[PDB]
């Protein structure tokens, strides 16, 4: 289908719609495609899963249902007319679609049109109700009765097919069809009057049945075996978890870039048992307030640096003006987008992408000059006092940018030279 990355890149109108839905994606799009000059093919090539998500969101439809059983008219009846319900009715009933397609633009307007549609006899007939001859309905829609009957016969013709043999009751009734005994009672014959004409409950059963087979064929759209279904697994072997076990072998290698004796540890054990059974002194443990003073010096030396870190243990409040702040933010964001595309370039490992790497490297050099002139402008417009803040804030991304430049230069000298 239209599910390949090529087709997702091809659906430019869908790209247009999702771009128009988003906002920061638009801003990124002008800055890259329109301002910097990024081709949209590799703009969206980094967004293929998001394009797929949008395509799935747009390209889905609901399951069918009976609009007529669900919807009740509730004296002009009030209607909560929904266009989704209207199209539900339309592709539920092509007879209704055909009655719509020649009435609204040619004969009469839309509100009078659906007023006649609610008024009509076919409304309550195709609805969950036997049609009454007392009802006046809509005489215009009464011309569609025999057309819908033709549709009924045609749909019956296309639905009718040879029946699976074991299921088929016609084989049972035709097993001995020459039996001449006695017919059953009035109970077993369908509900008819004294004139023999039926109530039509078999007819409405046929209609609701045919609704079920339209559901079956809606499932059965574009979008031997008897042995297995007659086989019984009740007295058979249960399914076995064939899952593989895992065993471990453990040998940790030691790190890559004096010994006391048993006599020594025995005699020190003897000495320490002697001291233990000898004496324990309470107040000998108090330090001399100079070695304790150096302990305090070391402790406060730790405390000063650690609490200075702990002084700085939505984002943080900034002294930048909002215009310069957002300009730095968006330049940082688009330069990150460049560098991610550069990792796409470099980790591709193809000679095919060489000119792409070259032209992008030119774009990154332009980004470097943009950053330098940006810092120069903030310097000369602010006296560097907050341009230092700007440069320090944008420092790590340009550091990784310089990392990318050095990698490109070194690998170019390695391969070319």
């Amino acid at each position: 289908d239209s599910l390949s990355k090529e087709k997702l890149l091809t659906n430019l109108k869908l790209q247009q719609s999702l771009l128009k839905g988003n906002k920061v994606l638009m801003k990124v799009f002008q800055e890259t495609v329109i301002n910097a000059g990024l081709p949209p093919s590799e703009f969206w090539s980094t967004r293929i899963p998001l394009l797929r998500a949008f395509a799935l969101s747009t390209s889905q439809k609901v399951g069918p249902y009976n609009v007529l059983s669900t919807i009740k008219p509730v004296n002009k009846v009030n209607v909560n007319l929904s266009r989704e319900k209207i199209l539900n009715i339309f592709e539920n009933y092509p007879i209704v679609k055909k009655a719509y397609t020649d009435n609204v633009p040619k004969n009469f307007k839309e509100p009078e049109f659906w007023a006649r549609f609610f008024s009509s006899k076919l409304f309550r007939k195709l609805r969950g109700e036997k049609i009454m001859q007392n009802d006046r309905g809509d005489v215009i829609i009464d011309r569609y009765l025999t057309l819908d009957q033709e549709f009924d016969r045609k749909d019956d013709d296309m639905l009718l097919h040879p029946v699976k043999k074991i299921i088929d009751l016609d084989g049972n009734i035709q097993d001995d069809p020459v039996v001449r005994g006695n017919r059953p009672d009035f109970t077993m014959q369908p509900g008819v009057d004294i004139n023999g004409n039926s109530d039509g409950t078999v007819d409405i059963l046929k209609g609701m049945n045919r609704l079920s087979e339209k559901m079956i064929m809606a499932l059965k759209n574009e979008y031997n075996d008897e042995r297995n279904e007659l086989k019984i697994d009740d007295l058979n072997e249960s399914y076995k978890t064939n899952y593989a076990i895992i065993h471990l072998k453990r040998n940790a290698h030691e790190k890559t870039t004096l010994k006391v004796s048993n006599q020594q540890m025995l005699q020190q054990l003897s000495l320490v048992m002697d001291n233990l059974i000898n004496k324990l002194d309470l107040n000998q443990v108090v330090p001399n307030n100079e070695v304790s003073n150096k302990i305090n010096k070391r402790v406060i030396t730790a405390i000063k640096i650690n609490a200075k870190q702990a002084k700085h243990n939505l984002e943080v409040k900034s002294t930048l003006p909002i215009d310069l702040l957002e300009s730095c933010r968006m330049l940082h964001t688009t330069c990150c987008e460049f560098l991610k595309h550069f990792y796409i370039h470099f980790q591709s490992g193809e000679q095919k992408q060489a000119s792409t790497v070259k032209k992008l490297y030119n774009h990154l050099k332009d980004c470097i000059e943009k950053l330098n002139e940006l810092f120069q402008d903030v310097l000369n417009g602010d006296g560097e006092s907050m341009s230092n803040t700007c440069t320090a804030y944008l420092k790590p991304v340009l550091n990784s940018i310089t990392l990318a430049t050095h990698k490109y230069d070194e690998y170019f000298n390695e391969y070319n030279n």
Partner: peptide, 21 residues
């Protein structure tokens, strides 16, 4: 507002311009 529409329809004909060329 409307200012996004003239951007993305100019790009619509810009993509068609490279499509024919």
């Amino acid at each position: 507002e409307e200012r996004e529409n003239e951007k993305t329809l100019n790009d619509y004909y810009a993509a068609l311009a490279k499509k024919q060329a």
